[PDB]
Each structure stands twice: as C-alpha cells, then as structure tokens.
C-alpha cells in the first residue's frame, strides 16, 4: 500500500516467462496469448444418453 | 469541534467538487465544521481506491 507504489522489474520477466509457456496437460494443449487468456484449447462436446 | 471526513473525487469531476464546496459554504454552522480531505484518483482502479 506504500505510496507511491513501486513494482519490481523482475515481475515483467516472470510474466513473459509464464505467458510464453506451452505444455501438455489434463486440459489438453496449454498455451497463452499476450494478455494471458487460453489459446488453442479443445472443449469436448458431450451428450447425456440412456447408458 | 473539528470533524474530519475523507472524500474521493474521480479525476475529471469538476462540478461535483464545486457543488461539494458550495454545500460546505451553505450548510456550515457555528456548532461544528466539517474538515474535508479531498483525494483525486482513478475511480475505476481498485488499487487506487484501496490505497
Ligand atoms: C492456435 O490458436 C490460433 C489463434 O486463433 C489459431 O490461429 C491456430 O489455428 C490455433 N491452432 C490450432 C492447431 O488450432
């Protein structure tokens, strides 16, 4: 809360590090855009049947 | 008999602070006097509001 707030430099680097990640996981292909949202995901479309 | 009251005016709010001061002039009394501390901020910013 100290004013004026000062951010560390390293943070941006860690951010870019996280956003540049592409890995394989339980959610399928995991990759992010510049803003941090998910990209290239796959959502299985399913229907409930008798069985 | 000093009463400290904080206030938050979004940057670009002019007539509002004007009416605030006019109100301060009209409703002032001998009994007690309000002592405002005005703070301009980015009203949409949560960090700014918290701070
Ligand atoms: C990955 O996402 C980008 C962004 O829409 C798209 O252009 C590309 O075709 C995607 N790749 C696959 C294999 O779906």
Curated annotation (Swiss-Prot), chain B:
It is found in: Cell membrane; Postsynaptic cell membrane; Postsynaptic density membrane. Induction: Down-regulated in the pyramidal cell layer of CA1 in the hippocampus by global ischemia. It comes from the Eukaryota. Palmitoylated. Depalmitoylated upon L-glutamate stimulation. Ubiquitinated by RNF167, leading to its degradation. Ionotropic glutamate receptor that functions as a ligand-gated cation channel, gated by L-glutamate and glutamatergic agonists such as alpha-amino-3-hydroxy-5-methyl-4-isoxazolepropionic acid (AMPA), quisqualic acid, and kainic acid. L-glutamate acts as an excitatory neurotransmitter at many synapses in the central nervous system and plays an important role in fast excitatory synaptic transmission. The postsynaptic actions of L-glutamate are mediated by a variety of receptors that are named according to their selective agonists. This receptor binds AMPA (quisqualate) > L-glutamate > kainate. This is Glutamate receptor 2. The gene is Gria2. The chain holds residues 25 to 75 of 883 of the full protein.
């Amino acid at each position: 809360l100290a004013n004026p707030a000062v951010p560390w430099g390293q943070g941006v680097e860690i951010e870019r590090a996280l956003k540049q990640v592409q890995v394989e996981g339980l959610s399928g292909n995991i990759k992010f855009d510049q803003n941090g949202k998910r990209i290239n995901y796959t959502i299985n479309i399913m229907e409930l049947k008798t069985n | 008999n000093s009463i400290q009251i904080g206030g938050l005016f979004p940057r670009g709010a002019d007539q509002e602070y004007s009416a605030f001061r006019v109100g301060m002039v009209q409703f002032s009394t001998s009994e007690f006097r309000l002592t405002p501390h005005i703070d301009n901020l980015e009203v949409a910013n949560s960090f700014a509001v918290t701070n």
